[PDB]
Each structure stands twice: as structure tokens, then as C-alpha cells.
Amino acid sequence: MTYNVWNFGESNGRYSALTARGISKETCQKAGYWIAKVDGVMYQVADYRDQNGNIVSQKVRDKDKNFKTTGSHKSDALFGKHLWNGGKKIVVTEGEIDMLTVMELQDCKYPVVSLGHGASAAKKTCAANYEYFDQFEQIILMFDMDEAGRKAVEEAAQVLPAGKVRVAVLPCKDANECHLNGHDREIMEQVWNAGPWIPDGVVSALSLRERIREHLSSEESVGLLFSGCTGINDKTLGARGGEVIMVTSGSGMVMSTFVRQQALQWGTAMGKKVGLAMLEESVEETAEDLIGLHNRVRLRQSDSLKREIIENGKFDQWFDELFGNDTFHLYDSFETDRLLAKLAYMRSGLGCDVIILDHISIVVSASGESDERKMIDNLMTKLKGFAKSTGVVLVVICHLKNPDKGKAHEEGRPVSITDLRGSGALRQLSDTIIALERNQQGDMPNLVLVRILKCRFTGDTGIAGYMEYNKETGWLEPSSYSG
Amino acid sequence: DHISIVVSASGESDERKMIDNLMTKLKGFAKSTGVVLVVICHLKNPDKGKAHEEGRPVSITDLRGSGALRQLSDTIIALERNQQGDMPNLVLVRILKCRFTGDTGIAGYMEYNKETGWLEPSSYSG
Amino acid sequence: MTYNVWNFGESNGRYSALTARGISKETCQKAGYWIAKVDGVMYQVADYRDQNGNIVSQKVRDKDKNFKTTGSHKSDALFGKHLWNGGKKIVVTEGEIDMLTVMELQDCKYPVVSLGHGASAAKKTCAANYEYFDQFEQIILMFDMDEAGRKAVEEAAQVLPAGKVRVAVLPCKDANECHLNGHDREIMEQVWNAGPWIPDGVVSALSLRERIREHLSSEESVGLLFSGCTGINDKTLGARGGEVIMVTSGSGMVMSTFVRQQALQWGTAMGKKVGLAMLEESVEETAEDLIGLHNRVRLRQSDSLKREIIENGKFDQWFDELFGNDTFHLYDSFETDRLLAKLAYMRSGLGCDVIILDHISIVVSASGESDERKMIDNLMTKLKGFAKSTGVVLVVICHLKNPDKGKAHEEGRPVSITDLRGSGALRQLSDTIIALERNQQGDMPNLVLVRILKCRFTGDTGIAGYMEYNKETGWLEPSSYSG
């Protein structure tokens, strides 16, 4: 069986004053700190009783700094616990001697208990007692003023009830080191009105002034302005980093131009480094398309001119002109995880601030899996993550499913977010949705409309303007147009 | 703001179920401590004809979750806005529920000032 | 394959007398209770054969109380079955040993068989054998004299043929406990001419005189008149006890008032004790709503007046006034079975004659189960039972599913029983259905219609009158209105 609880008298017990600690005799008497002496040597005995009054366990000391624990010292032991059942405020100290201290300074009139295994078992001993401690209005953790002692406080309050915990802050190691000639009045100023908290994520507004100011200057409102239709800008205020812009529309190559145009100037007029994953076409191809675009000439789309500028040096000239500022970089192909990784190193290694991903519809490689409905969404998220996690601007192109209802896409028919592809991810995760409509058999077969289908940052949405295709130069030029 | 985000303890199925679990801890927190707990929550998307920006009214059936909120919540205020219409800036307010009074229904209108950023109160009815 | 049937001789078989049970050697021999011994230990083998004579299965025992079942023990196994094909009377015992017993006491001259899986499979084993048992004039169920043993009898007779079953009633647990020194003659007095009972719910008219007389005086044609719209009364003739009135309607708080109002007048005007389970709100809340309603003032809905009557004594006054006739009693909350039980004790213990159950839609606690569609019904019945079984008047509020069809509920849209929630149980089990409609955006946004959707007792149904909400007093006042 377990070590018998030590009988008072059996062991030559006296309630004497701890002269070495400035704890009065009357004090030791109330908390149950008695001085026995068995088989010769004189031991210091701390009487742990439950709320019912009965002595359940003992912690005994000898001079040299040893111990001996009697009874059954359960995981919820609190020395002094039996004295208080309720109250407006209970101090909780690390050790028995420190409990005796607060019990003095206060003429033993208010509640103090000490941790049963104190030091390390701050978390366990505490949560074991949630109910007992909730009996009081505020719980004042007066623990050791050291490395592991502040830690104890932390782990303690984590498991302790609600907004009741307040940390004690003393001038020395513990509440007794203070008493032992020093600052009784310092311990006092804590028992009444200590410092109340732990909150590792709660953050009063007042305490954000600075973070906000620096935010306001740093981050930018008018991030990177859409080109070829002020309107897009007016409504969306641009492409802020870490957003996810999503261009969409009918048969739109109109769509793949629009995105190209943006790429173009962003990496030229603006300083920004554009990264391009044009999954549809080759990396040489898209480069040509850029160059020709930049020179307002339909380059690939002309045998004669290709030959011309190869020979007349204009190629190498135009090439330098556009590209020689290490600002455009392309993912060149032949998975989802695999792609996303490449995209990331564009952001992280070459540090471009825009990544244009032309045409999400192409998932590709890891084949044994059902609906593109579902998967489109899975990728969607990794993307938005990439986006917000790294602050890169992610333009993502995306093609439309086809009505089943009367007028087609080349018949102009407007698009809504319902009209949307996917099964919700993009319809959600994307920050601005720009749609471009084009009724290629009509009044202005080259006229294309721009709907802002959505825009977190402003929520100003709708028809936002018009552009016109220049079959000739290859640009989406801005156009006069309304009612 | 915005219950739809559960977040961190990953090995567990339907947000259907879990939404409810949190719901309760919340209603507990609430009633247990008398704090007023406003909880924002976003809508699942019809499958039926007219979308959200087409104004389409919302019912408690129309509700997300799988019952906890549809229950545990004391007042449900919904706001509708047909952002492609006559008043794209006009927004309707249904009281979808209100224990304390049970007087429910259309409860008034507001208008978005794209300019000041406020939901201004508005003149409106039949 | 399945456990081989145990060969007699292969296993060291003897037809020995069970000295422990007062079953003779000659007895065990006829029914096929033999004593083998395989691989060392000595087993007791019961030979189950079909009506054709062939051994189809074995139930083997060892000392310590174990088993081992040979052959194919079909769901229709009867030990002893092969011995009798026809007769004037066949005893049917729970286990093999008890069969051996009756087979003694009778010098094995009459028929006894024992249940194949006895105990629990009383229902299945029996109905599996309808034909076999119908071969006899009367079937004497001599089962265990305990909890599950009387149950066995019950489930058994249910599936057994016509007016043939008669229950055996012995002085001890089973027919063998009797034999094992006690009352052989007690077993005998049952085998011949014992109890024949099975009508636990059939009830000849003659034998209802008293129950009828006392009904006729107790429960009233015009049982409890609905208040606030003669009409409800004119058509339904009131809320007769044992009925289940069902109040339903759109968003209707109108509904929760109407019910409240009735609670009010029955518990004050009329002598009747009302019991309320207002599951939606607190018990204090509903109490206030009553008081306020009784005093024609919107009590909870007014800071000022609350304060006023707390101080000016009017509260304690009003409270006594309304309540102090021990006439209102409330279920106060934080399962289905669990609720039903509480409501029962209101009926049975405090003896209220109406119980109002606000808002069936709330099922609550026993979670692992599908459609509220189905469950709503399951509760529905327990309730109707409660009702008829105890004569309490059970008003049950219930809320409406929402159209999908054009005009909503606040648009007045009338309601039909199709319009009904549930999946049939209320649409059925409820005796009167009162619906209230209110077009809260219209000509009389305070005008509310009352349809009687159904009324067994009279079957006079339809539009039955109008009331008007007094936003000011809180009441559903009666109103002038028609074509």
C-alpha cells in the first residue's frame, strides 16, 4: 500500500512559526503547515486536504532540501484548497511557502492556495480544478518570476476559466523572496489589481495604430491598372497583389488577347516582372505574339513580315527592345501539384509579381480521378493560397461552358456568375471577375463588352466599358460607347 | 464574421456536421455569458433559376448548415440585393426569425452609397 | 462447410439418465437427449430432427455452461418436433431440459417440443411452424416465469394460430425448477386445462358499461370553447378531451399568440389546469408573456413598464392574480421519449386537462437517425396515444414548410392539408386542424383568417372567422368580416 498519512502527535508535531521565512506561527496554523520530528530528524509537513476537510496527502520536508510525500497526492492537489469555497479573488502561488506568505500579508483573510505539483504540472493541476477555481471572480496567478515560471503561468491560464486570470508580477523570484526583507507592498499591489491576460491573438484596436499607419502607406489601393478600358479600373481599382483576377468569356481569343495586352504593358510601362504560363501554346509562340503585339503588327500571322525582320535586323532589335529587361518569364510545358510548384518558383525565385495562368480548364497529370467539376475547385484553392500566401498577382483565364439556352456566345449573350464554369471554387476564391462578351455576328462584330462580374475590394460591379478588336494591329483598343 | 470558416483540427468529415458543433459552443458562450453574439454567415447557391445577385429572396430552408444555426440562432436577419436591376444599390431586409418576438418578415430597405460606403436607410414599400 | 452432425458412437454416446434434473434414462432416450464424450470431456447432446425423422442439427453442452451447435439449426427448429404429427394438445417449452420434464411427468405419452432458439427467437421459431402447430387442437405455451419469459409468450402467441394458445403458469422459473423437488402436480394442473389467455386489447362491449358511463359524465360535446372567434367553436364544437388539436400557419407568431391566448382563457375563465411545453422559449419568458397578455399590456416588450410594476407592487399583484390558482404549469427545458414522459406526468401527476406543445418541429435528443419527415410521424403517434389513452386535450402547434409557389405566407396564401408539413402522421392523427393565415403586407396586415382544415368530431370545415392583431394589447381580438 501507499505511504500512510502522517499523524500529528504520532510524529512530534508543533505548529511553530517559520522564523526563516517571516511566516508567523498563527499563519502556519491555519493553512496546515506543521513541524513534526520522526526517528530523530525534524521535518516540515504540509497538509493537503480536499474541499471536504479530510487530509488526503502530505508533502514533508527535511532541512537539506529533500522530500517525502504521504497519502495519495492526486493530480488535482491544491494546498490551502479546503480553506476557501468561493470568493471574489483567489491568489494561486507556485509553492507552499509562498502561499503561507500571501496568507500573512493578508492576515489570512483571503484566499490563497498553492499548486500541488506546482512547477511543471501547472497545466494538469489547474485544469483538474476548473470548477473549484470558477468559484471565484478572478484567479490571480502569482508564480515564479523566471524562465519556467512565466511558462507555468502561460500553460496555466490556457486551461483556466475565461477572462478571470490575471498574472502577478513581483520584483523577485517569488512572493516570499519579496517578503524576506524587501517589498511586502509590492506583493500587495498585485493581490489587489494584478495584470490580467494571456490573449495570443486577441488584439485591442487601440493597439494597432502603428500597424495600420504603416499598412496605409505600404499597401495599395490602386494596384496595377488594367489596360485598354478605364472602367475595368474605375470599377475594380486594379489588380492588387495577392488577389486572384479571373478573366472569362465566350469563344474569346478576345480573352487570350486581353490577358496578353495586360502582361505586355505591365511588364513594360510598369516595372513589374510578369510570369506567364500560357498552357495552350508553346513558349516560343507566346513570345512572338508578345513582340508583334508590342509592335502593333500581327507577327506570327504573316509569312512576309517574319522573313523581313529576321533579315533587316529588326527582329533582334524589337526583341531586345521588349524583352531585354529580364521582365518577362514563361513556364514552358509538355500535374496540378507539379505546375503549382513551377508557378511558385516564378514568384519566389525569379520574383515576378504577376503570374498569368492561361486557361485553367487545362488541369493535367495524375489520372485515376473523376469530375473536372470537383478538381477544378481543388486547384482553384491551391491557387488562391499561392496568391494570398505570397502576394503575387494571379490573373487566371477561364473558358465558359456552353448554354443550351437559345443564343450562343458569338451571339453576344451576356454572362453571369451562375453562367460560370467550375462548381463554386472560382465563383468564390477569385477576387475580381472580368468577363468579356463579343457578339461576333452583329452590328459591331469587333465590339466587345466588359462586365465586372465581381470585385471584393470594391464591390462596384457591372458593365464597365467597351473595347474594339483591331484585326489589323492585334490590340484590344478602348472604345467610345454606351446607351 | 463569417462562420463558414471553421479552422484547425483536420481529419474530419462534413462541414455540414461540424458547422453545427461550433454553432452550439457559440450559442453556449452566448447564453452562458450574456454577451451579444452577431454571427455572419454566407449562403449556399441555389441550383434554382435566379441567383443571388438576381435578388432572389432567402428562406430558412434556403439556409446553410444542417440545422444548428437554423435553430440555435435567436434572430436571423437576411439581406437581399438584386445587383442587376432597377435598384442595384437597393437592399431588402427579411427578418427570418426572432425568438423574443416572432414578429418576422420584410422589415425595411436600405441603399448602398458607393460613395460614402454606408448602408443608408431608404424610403420604400409596395 | 458447416459443423458436422455428431455421430452416436463416433462420440462415446450413452442414453443415460439426467440424475441432476429428475429426468429418467428412458426419457432422454425418446426425445433424443444423449450423453457423448469427445477428446476427453463429456458433452450433453440434444438431437434436433425434422418431421421426417432425419437429424438436421445438434445442440451440445459441456459442464461449465457452454455450447456447440452441430448441423444446420434452421430458423424453425423445434426439439421433439419429430415425435408428434398431430394431437389434441401440445406443450411448448422454452428449453430442451424442460421438454424432458413434461415428457416425464407424462410418461412420454403426449406431445412436448422445445423452442429451437427459445428465449429471444420466440416469435420467429414459432411463426416458422404455424402449420406444424395447427396440427394440434390447443397449443400450451409453458415458457419461463420471468420478465423476458412472459414477453416470449406474448410474441409467440401473436404469430401462433387463432384461439388455440393457452399460457402455462408455474410456481417457479421453469417447468424443471418445479420438478426438481417441488410441485410436479402444479405442472400437471397446467398441461391439462391451464390458462387460455391472449386478449390484451380486445374488449367486449358489455364489459365497457362502467368505462362508458364515467366517460359520458366527464367529457363534454362542447369540450372547451376556443376563444376569440366563435366560428372556431361553431365549426369544431370545441376541444374535446383525448383529441389532438393542431394549430398551424405561416410565420405566424399570430399562431403562438393564438395558442397562448387559449391557454390563458382555459386556465382562468374555465377551471381547467393548463400545462405548457413551450419548447422555443424559457419558462420565465412564457410566464411573462402570459401575465402581460392577461393584463392586456405588452409586458416583456417594454423596459419602462417592467420596472414600473416591479416597484409599484403591481407585479406581485398581477402574478398572484393570474397564477395563484395552481392552474398553469410549464415544462422547462435545456429526447422524444424523454419529453413525452414529462408531458405524461403533467397529465397524470399534476392532472392538467390541456397540454399545449409549442412547436412540434422541434423533435430533440437521440442523434444517429434520418428524415425529420419520418420521425415527425413517430412522435405524432406517441402523442395521439398519450391523448386518447389519457383524455388530456393536446393542442400541438406546428409550423409550415415554404411554398416554392409564387405567393409566400406573409402574402396571405391560404393553406391546405396538402400544404401540410410532416409526411402524413399529423395530416392523419390530429383530430381538429386549425390554420391561421395572415397577409402581413396588404389591406389588413393585422387581419388574420382562420381555416378549419379538419375536424373529425364534426367534419364541418372551412373558413371559420377572422381576428385582428392588436399590436398594442398583444391580443388576437375577434373581428367583423366576410364577403
Ordered list of secondary-structure elements with their pairings:
This is part of a larger assembly, with three copies of chain A.
Chain A (H helix, E strand, L loop, with lengths): L24 H7 L1 E3 L8 E6 L5 E8 L3 E6 L6 E2 L7 E7 L2 H10 L6 E4 L6 H6 L2 H5 L1 E7 L4 H13 L5 E3 L7 H5 L4 H8 L17 H10 L13 H5 L7 E6 L4 H13 L7 E5 L4 H12 L8 H9 L2 H10 L4 E4 L5 H12 L5 E5 L13 H19 L2 E7 L25 H5 L2 E7 L8 E9 L6 E8 L6 E4 L4
Parallel strand pairs in A: 6-7, 6-8, 8-9, 10-14, 10-15, 11-12, 11-13, 13-14
Antiparallel strand pairs in A: 1-2, 2-3, 3-4, 5-7, 15-16, 16-17, 17-18
Helix pairs in contact in A: 10-11, 14-15
What's the gist of this structure?
By secondary structure, the first copy, chain A, is of the alpha/beta class. Chain A has helices at residues 25-31, 96-105, 122-127, 130-134, 147-159, 175-179, 184-191, 209-218, 232-236, 254-266, 283-294, 303-311, 314-323, 337-348, 372-390, 425-429, and strands at residues 33-35, 44-49, 55-62, 66-71, 78-79, 87-93, 112-115, 136-142, 165-167, 244-249, 274-278, 328-331, 354-358, 393-399, 432-438, 447-455, 462-469, 476-479. The first copy, chain A, folds into two domains: 1-200, no CATH class; 201-483, Rossmann fold (3-Layer(aba) Sandwich).
Question: How is this structure best described in words?
Answer:
The structure is cut from a larger assembly and holds three copies of chain A. In chain A, a hairpin with an 8-residue loop joins β15 (432-438) and β16 (447-455). Chain A has helices spanning 25-31, 96-105, 122-127, 130-134, 147-159, 175-179, 184-191, 209-218, 232-236, 254-266, 283-294, 303-311, 314-323, 337-348, 372-390, 425-429; strands at 33-35, 44-49, 55-62, 66-71, 78-79, 87-93, 112-115, 136-142, 165-167, 244-249, 274-278, 328-331, 354-358, 393-399, 432-438, 447-455, 462-469, 476-479. In chain A, α10 (254-266) packs across α11 and α14 (337-348) runs parallel beside α15. The first copy, chain A, has 16 helices and 18 strands. Chain A folds into two domains: 1-200, no CATH class; 201-483, 3-Layer(aba) Sandwich (Rossmann fold). In chain A, the strands form three sheets. In chain A, strands 12-11-13-14-10-15-16-17-18 form a nine-stranded mixed beta sheet. In chain A, strands 5-7-6-8-9 form a five-stranded mixed beta sheet, sandwiched between helices. In chain A, strands 1-2-3-4 form a four-stranded antiparallel beta sheet. With 483 residues, chain A is an alpha/beta fold. Chain A is rod-shaped, with a radius of gyration of 37 Å. The interface between B and C is medium-sized, with 13 and 13 residues. Chains A, C: One of its GO terms (molecular function) is ATP hydrolysis activity. Chains A, C: ATP binds at residues 249-256.
